Amino acid sequence: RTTRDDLINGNSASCADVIFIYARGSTETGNLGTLGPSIASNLESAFGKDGVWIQGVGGAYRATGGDNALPRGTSSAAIREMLGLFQQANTKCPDATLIAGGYSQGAALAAASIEDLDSAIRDKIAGTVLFGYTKNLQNRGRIPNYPADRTKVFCNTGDLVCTGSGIVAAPHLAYGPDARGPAPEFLIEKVRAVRG
Numbered sequence: 001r002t003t004r005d006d007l008i009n010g011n012s013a014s015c016a017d018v019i020f021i022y023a024r025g026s027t028e029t030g031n032l033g034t035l036g037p038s039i040a041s042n043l044e045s046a047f048g049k050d051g052v053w054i055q056g057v058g059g060a061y062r063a064t065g066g067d068n069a070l071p072r073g074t075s076s077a078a079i080r081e082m083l084g085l086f087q088q089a090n091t092k093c094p095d096a097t098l099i100a101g102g103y104s105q106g107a108a109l110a111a112a113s114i115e116d117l118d119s120a121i122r123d124k125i126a127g128t129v130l131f132g133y134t135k136n137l138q139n140r141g142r143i144p145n146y147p148a149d150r151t152k153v154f155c156n157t158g159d160l161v162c163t164g165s166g167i168v169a170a171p172h173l174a175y176g177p178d179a180r181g182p183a184p185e186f187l188i189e190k191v192r193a194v195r196g
Contacts, residue, residue: 061078136153
C-alpha cells in the first residue's frame, strides 16, 4: 500500500501512541513510495495496527526531481506540507510519540521541516531515519537543531547524493534491506527508550 493517510483519516478520540510521518523520494508513487511500506509493516508488527499511525507526506509535496536543486533540497510548498502534518499530529494527538523518515528528496524535506519546526514539537520526534540523504555532506550527516543520537543516516558507499552530487547511481536504489531491518529497528528502539 503506497498510500497511507492514517493521521488525516484517524479519529482523534482514538489516537495511536506512535505516529510515523514519512516523505518519499523523487518520482515515487502514492505518499510512501518504495521504502515507506516496508518500514510501515514492521512498525505495525511492533506496536500493532491500532498502535501506530502511518502518514505519508502527500498534498503539495509532488516529489519533483527538479526541486532537488532548490536551496533546501526541496520546495517551500513541500516543507509547508510536512510542517503542517507534524502540527496536525501535535494537535490531533498531544500524547503521541512521533518518528519520521525520508528517502532522497524526502530526506532533505524531513531535515528542512525538522529544522524549522517549533522546538516543542521537534522534541517529540524520538527518532528520524534518512536514506540517501541529499544534504548529508552539506549538513555533516546531521539534521540542524536535532540531536545526533536521535538521527540515523543510511548512506551507501557509491551513493553520490551522500557526497554532494545530484547524480543517481545504483547504490541510491539499494536501500530496501535497510528499510526492512535496521531502519525500523532504530525507530522502535528510540520510541521504546522514551515510552518504555
